[PDB]
Design a protein around this nucleic acid. Structure first.
Ligand SMILES: [Mg+2]
Ligand SMILES: [Mg+2]
Ligand SMILES: [Mg+2]
Ligand SMILES: [Mg+2]
Ligand SMILES: [Mg+2]
Ligand SMILES: [Mg+2]
Ligand SMILES: [Mg+2]
Ligand SMILES: [Mg+2]
Ligand SMILES: [Mg+2]
Ligand SMILES: [Mg+2]
Ligand SMILES: [Mg+2]
Ligand SMILES: [Mg+2]
Ligand SMILES: [Mg+2]
Ligand SMILES: [Mg+2]
Lengths: 394, 176, 239, 344, 124, 46, 101
RNA sequence: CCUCCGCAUAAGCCUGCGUCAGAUUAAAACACUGAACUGACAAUUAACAGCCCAAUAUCUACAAUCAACCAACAAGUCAUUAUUACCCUCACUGUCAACCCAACACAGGCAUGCUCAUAAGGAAAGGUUAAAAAAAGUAAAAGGAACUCGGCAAAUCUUACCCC
RNA sequence: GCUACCUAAGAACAGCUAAAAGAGCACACCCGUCUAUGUAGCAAAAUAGUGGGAAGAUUUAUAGGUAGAGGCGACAAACCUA
RNA sequence: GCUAAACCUAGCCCCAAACCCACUCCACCUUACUACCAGACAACCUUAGCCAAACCAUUUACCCAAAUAAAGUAUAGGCGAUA
């Protein structure tokens, strides 16, 4: 085996001691009294030294073989960086959920009504996009990190401004900086999800059940694919020190316990730092699954059985040009076997809001070709976003 | 307040100020401890006022009315400092029994000069420090020639001084 | 001369580590190898040359899966990250290796030969006579060192009882122990000798200074040497 | 060479210095409501402002960021005004502009930004360079305000004014007889910016009410320990004056108004500056703009900046609830966000 | 060439030298990871100023004060003035013990009390 | 061309090439300082 | 105090207290224009801001608001008779301000 | 009238055209009094850049070029996790200038931003006459390289052939 | 610290034709083929254009290393503080 | 007669005798003239060369033990200038 350790880069061994310590019954005459390092044969052996008073700036942590939270088995914690390879495959294998291409008919029946629209939705969203893309800062070409959350909150405010039409939107709040935690088993493999996204929307009333019992019972006959050359524990933080818990981001007494729609952000000014679309889909699937599992553990206790009242925890992940909608629904908690009842989720892939934006007018031979403005626009993405936002409040 | 930095308003420009006879060592040794501390504070305030007056006189391009008061306060505070240092040394000899509260030892540097190294008081010990170990303390056989040359130079200096003294004595005996 | 090597990483990882150029400077600072200096910045990839290696709590054979084939500027051939199990390690790519391929890293030597493909690896004791192999080792559990460039490959000659003579690309024979793991097939990035340079800008980008301008008179070593084939060097230790 | 007028300064009597540098006056108390238009149609729908729900949502948003929150360390005393009060402020302004949408239709199309800088550049006063190779020559005194509030509400139209343009006040502007370099004020040289929160191509050139927040350096206990009891309201007043002046300048220099060209209509501006518990209220109405010595020779117009004292909203949050909750502060907050533009 | 006879102050080095030199000021804290200073209230010299209300002593002495001989205050005089009377009193009765001497002010070590003399824990 | 500005004012290079630490980190500079002190140099190094 | 070795403070040690200080401040009249609240002093080279605040609030008991100090470098160009530069002693001026207005 | 300049940052001794008295003598290539001076008076106050990061193990292959079509090669300038301990807080270095390196107050040289000519900044001329000679600028009856070894300053704007 | 080479992090290049280019003219910039002025001059190597390059084998701010029985060298016995 | 000519003392060299010294407080090994933090590696080595022998390759007092005569004697030395 070719070792990766260079002798010139590692710490060199200390020189051997002199020929005075190998004499049984003879004490050496070193320089331990003059308190300075000498040229004259002087190099003894100093005993270890420790500090009697602990200092936060000079505190050493003990090794991992005696921590109070150390266990024999290693867990797998997923957060907001674990770039999974086979995103959808690992997501469906760890969450036990059937993949559905199209979206449910409820959001379509709620969004196709011409009355539930803005007085001038197209011009409003165009002005919002133009502002967030160019009129946000003093620079000419803003970075993705400085306009992604800006346009996110702009769209959130635009969707919230329709409270005067539907007297039910006042029961929402955009919670910032939240942490999730949910532990479960997956074929003798202890798993745990712990992430902190951008923002989340929490309501006081839970979302209604989407999938009825018919499709729930029919999904039992659906089997899940499993890759063989790759292990499902790939691209996961394998650690031995952890702590099992089923507590969500809010305890008892909080006015907004039930979530609604999770908002994940990929703020990165570089392509290598941005996540793949399949990776973002897997991340939002895992986040929705963790939220639903935490809600099930908090409401129906810590039991592994089938839930008679399913919960709906939606999610959506953007990046500054494309959108990825998600409608997740948990139906059971026992995930030890792969022959039981599966879950249902509606994933809408490939949803572009606009083709390209030109912050500066291109001039080819003293004449312009494309003026300043979002060239190419698809209102279907904004319609689906408004539908997912208004699905909570009828 | 801020009016203590000046003298009496009636003495604002009275040519000569009558103030003399500073403190002595015996009068300072006769006092206790709190009295000496309060007297030191009063002398410090007086020296600050005199410094302000001297600065104002130097800015106004006029001579100082009484410059001897500053020297008097200075020597009084120096005598008080000497008294308190002697008291501290006596107490240290009665308790610990070692002179000079600054510890150290006679160590030879690289230049071969027998100097008195003063301890810097660190946190970590010396057998693992990074900066203290880089401070060498050995002559190494190459400075003996320089030490011999310095000794010869000092011997020449002393011999020339003795020759000058002898020439002066001869001139004194010849003229007188 | 505070010359410290950039090879300060005793753990295998996947992130490309930044490397520092040398230009012919050792620990003293004098130029000892002429023709190196001034080139485009490159990043080093930790390439795992050892083919067969068991994972944690593993021992038997394991499957792999080729993901994506990239390019390595530190060599002529291209590399390809192949995932498998719960880890990902960089290995040398072979000819006709694309995305979605499946390779095997076995070690159990069978009674007869194994008609393996040009992607999987098997010990020399289970390969038929006359098979284009590459990345051959010298000692059991040491690592592949010979035949690792672009397109280079070797062909098995014969077998005796516990050795395996491998024909090297230099037309020279060389034997090795039977329990040595070697890949099967040819390395990718073929037709490398047909790469036309075009201008000195490419050589300056690669990091190669022009040769010396001094006119050196050719001595007696500039003539053609028609020499026979050197004898086969043996690596098998015999008591 | 231009100065750097920092709104969140730590100087002593910087309020009078800023009033002299901006030609503004201060009036203790809120401005009187415009009683010019007599509304005869006072008997119709009139949606009643349910203060109970507003107080409930306010206390909920306060306890969300102050009481219970899944944090990942302890609660460091430092940076506590950036992870507790800073998110609470934007949550409160968001829920306010969300609940006040049916009552005020102007907030439906308003652009609610989050932490956007506002810059403004002008010339005020002159002096004589003592040293350098340009001695004995006249030069201008340039200033620059680099303020970055937390939340801004920009609308399309302009709000209704309070006092007329030709309003006269017997209270003169404060003056100083010293060099402007005495307080912690310095001169640099960089790119001049006149920014309001968006570019000129945005149709939302005007605004409504801004919100600020003092950092951890300008706390109350830190000033009380440094023997500065009367240095609590002056910093708030100076910050409010600087922010409102920069906002009015950025709004006026986007329609074609500057030093020479004056204004044709006053620019009313509002701002709500608060800290971690105490809330302050200030007002402003841009009257004049020519501040150069060449144009400010016969300019009787003076700027007016209203304001009040700092009143706390809560008092000791403990026992999983609130102990004290003043209602007049919330009433003034919900009233300052319902100012509708004058539409005939 | 540059100057050599002048000392090295804090106005000679570039941007990387202004800071670590200083003018010999005593540090009262340290730095952190956010370019901040952590000042410790236990490191700043606290000036203890006593009350000067009922203090009848002027900084200048009158010329009517008689002079006296000057002599240093050695440790032997202080010893014979402080500890000698107590020792003579306890020995004249019959209770002196040369085993324990901690009741006269003598301390075998300096690590017990706060204000140590040989290491000098107090400033000035 | 105008070959006369053979000096570039810089304190970092001066301290790193002719500093007291560099002089005493090698017996050569120590002997140089000894000869300077023997001759009568008021200033030893930069 | 100046020219005195300060004791090394350990994490959790007693309060560093000085009795007989060795500082000499000088009240110098401002040369340029200054407001009515800013007072200019002259502290030695071994004195900071909090030390000056404590010195002014302990002895003179003057309410100090803010302290802004800087180093003044004396002139060094005057030549003697044997062609040698004359170094002037440097000092550190202060700019304290009152608290109660 | 010029602006092929100036203002800041970077490097650099640090007090080097502010006041007062001397201005009899002393340095202005001569004078007033002052960029080649003697002594006294005090400038510059940070928010500007630094002064930096408690450990044990682990994680980081899909560039930039409006990055959204396409297209590559020189294969590339930026990111975290689990655990332990830590709720004392705003101290320090400079903020002047007409300035640096070349023995100089030298037609030499110096990195980036700002309007590429403006709101920065300066005076080719001490006076008298129009000697010869020399240098820098406009053109000339006829020839346009016929003078010079050679199209050697110069303006028109210029094609083909040979060697390397 | 000027100059030969190397190393790590940065900056510079208007406009037109842009044939895809170690493309062309041309600002700032890198070097200096010729004329004229002086050789105790502005200068122990200067002044304007006629000049070549100016999207790359280009230039440059910072820091470090290679020194004489040698360093370096796209080889001039060229450079290593006039 | 203007320019400008002289006015003795800091002392300087070697003898005899004698052996000569090194913190008032702070700072001095990193960017000495810097109060405060985690790899401890750093000496132990024929000196050479010029000149002379008309060049020069062997060789050429210099080596640190008190005078002198022996004695420049035996000796070494391209058996020669020399030691
Ligand atoms: Mg070749
Ligand atoms: Mg050749
Ligand atoms: Mg300045
Ligand atoms: Mg010169
Ligand atoms: Mg001008
Ligand atoms: Mg003339
Ligand atoms: Mg003619
Ligand atoms: Mg001819
Ligand atoms: Mg020509
Ligand atoms: Mg070259
Ligand atoms: Mg080109
Ligand atoms: Mg070109
Ligand atoms: Mg040649
Ligand atoms: Mg000879």
């Amino acid at each position: 085996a070719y070792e990766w350790g260079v002798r010139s880069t590692r710490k060199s061994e200390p020189p051997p001691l002199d020929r005075v310590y190998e004499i049984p019954g003879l004490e050496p005459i070193t320089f331990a009294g003059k308190m300075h390092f000498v040229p004259w044969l002087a190099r003894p052996i100093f005993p270890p030294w420790d500090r009697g008073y602990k200092d936060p700036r000079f505190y050493r942590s003990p090794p991992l073989h005696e921590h109070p939270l150390y266990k024999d088995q290693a867990c797998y914690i997923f957060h907001h960086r674990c770039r999974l390879l086979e995103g959808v495959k690992q997501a469906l294998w760890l969450t036990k959920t059937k993949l559905i291409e199209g979206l449910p008919e409820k959001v379509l029946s709620l969004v196709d009504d011409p009355r539930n629209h803005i007085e001038n939705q197209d011009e409003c969203v165009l002005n919002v996009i133009s502002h967030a893309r160019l009129w946000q800062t003093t620079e000419e070409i803003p970075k993705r990190e400085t306009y992604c959350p800006v346009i996110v909150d702009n769209l959130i405010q635009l969707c919230k401004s329709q409270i005067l039409k539907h007297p039910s939107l006042a029961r929402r709040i955009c919670v910032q900086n939240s942490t999730f935690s949910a532990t479960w088993n997956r074929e003798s493999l202890l798993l745990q999800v712990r992430g902190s996204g951008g923002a989340r929307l929490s309501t006081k009333d839970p979302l209604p059940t989407i999938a009825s019992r018919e499709e729930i019972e029919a999904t039992k006959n659906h089997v899940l694919e499993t890759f063989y050359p790759i292990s499902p524990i790939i691209d996961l933080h394998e650690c031995n020190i952890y702590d099992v818990k089923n507590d969500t981001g809010f305890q008892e007494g909080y006015p907004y316990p039930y979530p609604h729609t999770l908002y994940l952000l990929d703020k990165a000014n570089l392509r290598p730092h941005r996540l793949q679309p399949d990776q973002l889909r897997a991340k939002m699937i895992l986040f929705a699954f963790g939220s639903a599992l935490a809600q099930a553990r908090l409401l129906y206790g810590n039991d592994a059985k089938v839930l008679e009242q399913p919960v709906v925890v939606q999610s959506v992940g953007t990046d500054g040009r494309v959108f990825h909608f998600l409608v997740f629904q948990l139906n059971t908690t026992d995930l030890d076997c792969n022959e039981g009842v599966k879950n249902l989720a509606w994933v809408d892939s490939d949803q572009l809001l606009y083709q390209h934006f030109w912050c500066l007018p291109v001039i080819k031979k003293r004449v312009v070709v494309e003026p300043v403005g979002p060239v190419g626009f698809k209102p279907e993405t904004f319609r689906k976003f408004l539908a997912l936002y208004l699905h909570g409040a009828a | 307040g801020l009016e203590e930095f000046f003298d009496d308003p009636k003495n604002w420009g009275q040519e000569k100020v009558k103030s003399g006879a500073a403190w002595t060592c015996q009068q300072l040794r006769n006092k206790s401890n709190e009295d000496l501390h309060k007297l030191w504070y009063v002398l410090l305030k007086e020296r600050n006022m005199l410094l302000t007056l001297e600065q104002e006189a130097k800015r106004q391009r006029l001579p100082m009315p009484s410059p001897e008061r500053l020297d008097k306060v200075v020597d009084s505070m120096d005598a008080l400092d000497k008294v308190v240092q002697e008291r501290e040394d006596a107490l240290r000899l009665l308790q610990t029994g070692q002179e000079r509260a600054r510890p150290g030892a006679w160590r030879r540097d690289i230049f071969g000069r027998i100097i008195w190294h003063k301890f810097k008081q660190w946190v970590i010990p010396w057998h693992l420090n990074k900066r203290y170990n880089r401070k060498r303390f050995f002559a190494l056989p190459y400075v003996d020639h320089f030490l011999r040359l310095e000794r010869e130079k000092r011997a020449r200096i002393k011999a020339r001084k003795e020759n000058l003294e002898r020439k002066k004595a001869k001139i004194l005996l010849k003229k007188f | 001369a505070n010359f410290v090597s950039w090879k300060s990483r005793t753990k295998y990882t996947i992130t490309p580590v930044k490397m520092r150029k040398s230009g012919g400077r050792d620990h003293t600072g004098r130029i000892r190898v002429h023709g190196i200096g001034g080139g485009h910045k490159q990043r080093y990839r930790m390439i795992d040359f050892l083919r067969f290696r068991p994972e944690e709590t593993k021992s038997g054979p394991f499957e792999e899966k080729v993901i994506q084939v990239r390019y390595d500027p530190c060599r002529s051939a291209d590399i390809a990250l192949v995932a498998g199990g719960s880890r990902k390690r960089w290995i040398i790519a072979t000819e006709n290796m694309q995305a979605g391929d499946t390779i095997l890293n076995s070690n159990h030597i069978g009674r007869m030969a194994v008609a393996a493909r040009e992607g999987d690896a098997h010990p020399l004791g289970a390969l038929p006579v006359g098979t284009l192999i590459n990345n051959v080792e010298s000692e059991p559990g040491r690592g592949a060192q010979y035949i690792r460039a672009a397109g280079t490959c070797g062909v098995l000659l014969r077998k005796v009882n516990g050795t395996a003579i491998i024909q090297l690309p230099s037309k020279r024979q060389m034997q090795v122990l039977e329990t040595c793991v070697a890949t099967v097939g040819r390395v990718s990035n073929v037709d490398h000798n047909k790469r036309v340079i075009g201008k000195a800008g490419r050589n300056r980008w690669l990091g190669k200074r022009p040769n010396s301008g001094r006119w050196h008179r050719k001595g007696g070593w500039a003539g053609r040497k028609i020499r026979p084939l050197p004898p086969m060097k043996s690596y098998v230790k015999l008591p | 060479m231009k100065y750097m007028v920092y709104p969140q300064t730590f100087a002593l009597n910087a309020d009078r210095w800023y009033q002299y540098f901006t030609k503004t006056v201060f009036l203790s108390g809120l401005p009187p409501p415009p009683a010019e238009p007599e509304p005869e149609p006072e008997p119709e729908p009139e949606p009643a402002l349910d203060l109970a729900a507003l107080r409930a949502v306010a206390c909920d948003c306060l306890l969300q960021e102050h009481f219970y929150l899944r944090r990942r360390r302890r609660v460091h005393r430092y940076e506590e005004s950036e992870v507790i009060s800073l998110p609470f402020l934007d949550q409160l302004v968001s829920t306010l502009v969300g609940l006040l949408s049916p009552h005020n239709p102007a907030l439906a199309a308003a652009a609610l930004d989050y932490r956007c800088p506002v810059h403004f550049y002008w010339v005020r006063g002159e002096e004589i360079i003592p040293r350098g190779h340009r001695r004995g020559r006249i030069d201008d005194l340039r200033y620059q305000i680099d303020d970055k509030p937390n939340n801004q509400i920009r609308i399309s139209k302009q709000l209704a004014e309070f006092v007329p343009l030709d309003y006269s006040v017997p209270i003169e502007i404060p003056t100083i007889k010293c060099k402007p370099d005495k307080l912690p004020l310095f001169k640099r040289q960089y790119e001049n910016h006149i920014f309001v929160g968006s570019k000129t191509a945005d149709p939302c050139c005007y605004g409504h009410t801004q919100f600020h927040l003092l950092p951890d350096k300008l706390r109350r206990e830190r000033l009380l320990r440094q023997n500065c009891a009367d240095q609590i309201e002056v910093v708030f007043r100076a910050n409010a004056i600087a922010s409102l002046f920069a906002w009015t300048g950025a709004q006026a220099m986007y329609q074609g108004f500057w030093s020479e060209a004056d204004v044709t209509r006053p620019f009313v501006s509002q701002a709500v500056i608060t800290d971690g518990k105490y809330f302050s209220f200030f007002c402003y109405q841009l009257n004049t703009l020519a501040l150069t010595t060449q144009a400010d020779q016969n300019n009787p117009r003076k700027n007016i900046c209203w304001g009040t004292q700092s009143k706390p909203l809560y008092e000791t949050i403990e026992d999983n609830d609130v102990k004290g909750f003043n209602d007049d502060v919330l009433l003034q907050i919900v009233h300052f966000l319902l100012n509708r533009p004058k539409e005939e | 060439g540059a100057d050599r006879m002048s000392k090295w102050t804090s106005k000679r080095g570039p941007r990387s030298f202004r800071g670590r030199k200083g003018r010999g000021a005593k540090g009262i804290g340290f730095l952190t990871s956010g370019w901040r200073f952590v000042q410790i209230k236990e490191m700043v010299p606290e000036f203890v100023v006593p009350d000067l209300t009922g203090f009848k002593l002027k900084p200048y002495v009158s010329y009517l004060a008689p002079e006296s001989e000057e002599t240093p205050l050695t440790a032997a005089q202080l010893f014979s003035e402080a500890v000698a009377p107590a020792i003579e009193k306890d020995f004249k009765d019959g209770t002196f013990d040369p085993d324990n001497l901690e009741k006269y002010g003598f301390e075998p070590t300096q690590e017990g009390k706060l204000f140590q003399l040989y290491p000098r824990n107090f400033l000035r | 061309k105008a070959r006369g500005n053979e000096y570039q004012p810089s304190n970092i290079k001066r301290k790193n090439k002719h500093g007291w630490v560099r002089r005493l980190s090698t017996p050569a500079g120590v002997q140089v300082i000894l000869r300077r002190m023997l001759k009568g140099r008021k200033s030893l190094s930069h | 105090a100046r020219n005195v070795v300060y004791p090394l403070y350990r994490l959790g040690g007693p309060q560093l207290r000085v009795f007989r200080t060795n500082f000499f401040i000088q009240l110098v009249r401002p040369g340029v224009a200054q407001p009515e609240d800013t007072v200019q002093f002259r502290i030695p080279m071994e004195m900071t801001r909090v030390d000056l605040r404590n010195y002014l609030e302990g002895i003179y008991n003057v309410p100090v608001a803010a302290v802004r100090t800087r180093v003044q470098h004396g002139s060094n160009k005057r030549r003697d008779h044997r062609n040698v530069r004359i170094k002037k002693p440097d000092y550190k001026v202060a700019y304290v301000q009152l608290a109660h207005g």
